[model samples]
Target: LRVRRASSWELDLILKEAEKYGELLHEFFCVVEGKYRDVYAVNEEVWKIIEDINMRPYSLGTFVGTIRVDENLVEKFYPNLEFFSLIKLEKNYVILGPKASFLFTTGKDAPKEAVREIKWQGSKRVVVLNDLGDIIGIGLINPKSDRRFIKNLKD
Candidate 1:
């Protein structure tokens, strides 16, 4: 996979999305784009080493996640579980009970009644977790509408 430094615009887009979850010190990481538009977070020191080298790099850092931009200029950031662990995510999370958590990982939607706790100031997307607070995956919620509560996206 070809790896290269991320463009200013690309970096900005990622930082913006990361802000939704929690505070992240941008200075600590140098974002890079790998094959398939996957984003990686590399330490500043490691990035310097990469810059000093003349050989083409294949992969240079921890895989943060993937970023996809559609024709309409809309951006979708699918953050990896490691990314969440890197930042202090205090919002947009839903805690589920045993049964719900099991079902969710099995590729099923979590019903409202199964939610043990939720903390999303006001967002449609949420990070799903089990009773123990371990992230299960991401989910979609129609808060305003009385339809689906926690629709599973990916784990």
Candidate 2:
């Protein structure tokens, strides 16, 4: 169920489609909508993780985990932000996009300053990478968007 990378054009075809079917879902997944909305892939690893331990991300990714990334907000009016960061939670669930996972989770510890920017500058769900870039899971935000490094922006 864990979905992977897709181009903006592709996302438009699947998610923002004028027409779609929730049944297929391209497989199992977690999703959420509103000001902050997006979808997530549910895989064997996450399956067991959801079955036990905590948040049961199975229902959370869409019910409580997902959010909106207007792009109108983070992408415009300011310098374009390529990626964001992730935050760990108390329960079996985690917060933020993209930056943490069960397998390769570690390294990318985003500074409060940067995270704050996400909240204000952007809907602030996704980030670039974490400490050592060991992250392998996406807790929130669009799991299908691009995570290209802003080599022109930073190291």
Candidate 3:
């Protein structure tokens, strides 16, 4: 519905990676009133992390909201974590993957330990969970790769 714009790739590539976790507006403490209002373009912080990904009708990447977890609220949320495909390694930690069905990195036939914990290994990056039933992060099952933890990640 508007005129076609000029190419801005040289200008747009400055952004590294940005998401709109921006603050809301508030009252400005201007003491004087001019004949015309002082106007400003988009703030640098707003545009700093933005990459001009021209994909239209976008909904997935935008910030939705926040979930503040605490003890009382966590009890309700805790039960919802289905015992999805996860395997227990020892008393304190568990590595999520195809249960006893697979060989461990230690090359042990540990089908005995896998009886109760039988979640299929979902990805090459193993989902590590603690004894307290909280997700730690994704880690590689083998020492063959240089990468360790998959931090701040998504599909």
Overall lDDT per candidate, in order of appearance: 0.72, 0.30, 0.25
The reply for model 1, stretches above 4 Å from the true place, is: 25-35, 54-59, 144-148
Per-prediction count of colliding residue pairs? Answer: 0, 19, 5
Best by lDDT: 1
Candidate 2, residue 65: Cα displacement in angstroms equals 7.3
When summed lDDT is taken over every stretch of 10 residues in candidate 2, the lowest stretch is: 77-86
> Using TM-score as the measure, which candidate wins?
1
Off by over 4 Å in 3: 1-118, 143-155
Better of 1 and 2 by TM-score: 1
RMSD of each: 2.9, 14.8, 18.6
Per residue, candidate 3 scores C-alpha lDDT tens digits across 105-146 of 333322223423323233333334433344443333343322
Q: For candidate 1, write residues 1-155 as lDDT tens digits.
A: 44556667767767776777677654333444454577667777666765665323344667777788768888766677666666667788899998899989998888888888988876677888898989888888866433357998876
In terms of lDDT, model 3 sits at: 0.25
What TM-score does candidate 2 get on C-alpha atoms? 0.21
Model 2 score (lDDT): 0.30
